[PDB]
Amino acid sequence: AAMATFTTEQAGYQMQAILQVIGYDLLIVVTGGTNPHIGDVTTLTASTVPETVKFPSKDNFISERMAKRIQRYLAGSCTITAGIHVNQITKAQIAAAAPMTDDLSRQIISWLQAHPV
Amino acid sequence: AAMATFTTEQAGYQMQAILQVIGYDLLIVVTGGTNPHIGDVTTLTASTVPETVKFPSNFISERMAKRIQRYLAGSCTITAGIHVNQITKAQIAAAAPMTDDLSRQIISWLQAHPV
Ligand SMILES: [Mn+2]
Numbered sequence: 001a002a003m004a005t006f007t008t009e010q011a012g013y014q015m016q017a018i019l020q021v022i023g024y025d026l027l028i029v030v031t032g033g034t035n036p037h038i039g040d041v042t043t044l045t046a047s048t049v050p051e052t053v054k055f056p057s058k059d060n061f062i063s064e065r066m067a068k069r070i071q072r073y074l075a076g077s078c079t080i081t082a083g084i085h086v087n088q089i090t091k092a093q094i095a096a097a098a099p100m101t102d103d104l105s106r107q108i109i110s111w112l113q114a115h116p117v
Numbered sequence: 118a119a120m121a122t123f124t125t126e127q128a129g130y131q132m133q134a135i136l137q138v139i140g141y142d143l144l145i146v147v148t149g150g151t152n153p154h155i156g157d158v159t160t161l162t163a164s165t166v167p168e169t170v171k172f173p174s175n176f177i178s179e180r181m182a183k184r185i186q187r188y189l190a191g192s193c194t195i196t197a198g199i200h201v202n203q204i205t206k207a208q209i210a211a212a213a214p215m216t217d218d219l220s221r222q223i224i225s226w227l228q229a230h231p232v
Contacts, residue, residue, distance in 0.1 A: 068166040069166060072179075098164060099164075
């Protein structure tokens, strides 16, 4: 109804998006790999450029990529947290972050289309 | 071979996509109606997030880019500008299916003529 979980796994590790709808607004928690955390927070609306806070620890490539993918479908505000970490991550797994972020975005968008906010 | 033209017509007005291949890259020009123009431009590769520019007084170039993004071997630049004088609501509603129709046409051609 107002909450949903999306997963994807490529190159041998999983990333996950937990979506929460509050009124007309979105909260999306993106984690993955061995040690999930909150490394970056991206805020936006459909009309505004996304801003990112980076906490002390490039997780924002994920939170901002997702934001750009879904910006056109936002009925209100959107907050996206990202914290993916893979131990001894490989170049392949690093390359898989963008396709995986796109995959979660497409599930999210398709969810929003089935569940108009 | 390096250029192709696709058309569609629904609700009594036509849209056309002219495709040009330059190296591995694509230029696609979408026009339609009585007054073709360039009102929005979408750029993308298979692996970047498409970016749309809107010129002042944008769904078509953006919508086509998302349709075809996975089939791209290089860069893609899609211009779009359709205009119908006294456009009707059903003609508005027809722009999306016509965009999809051109997209399926374009995907078919790309697979038959692998860049
Ligand atoms: Mn981090």
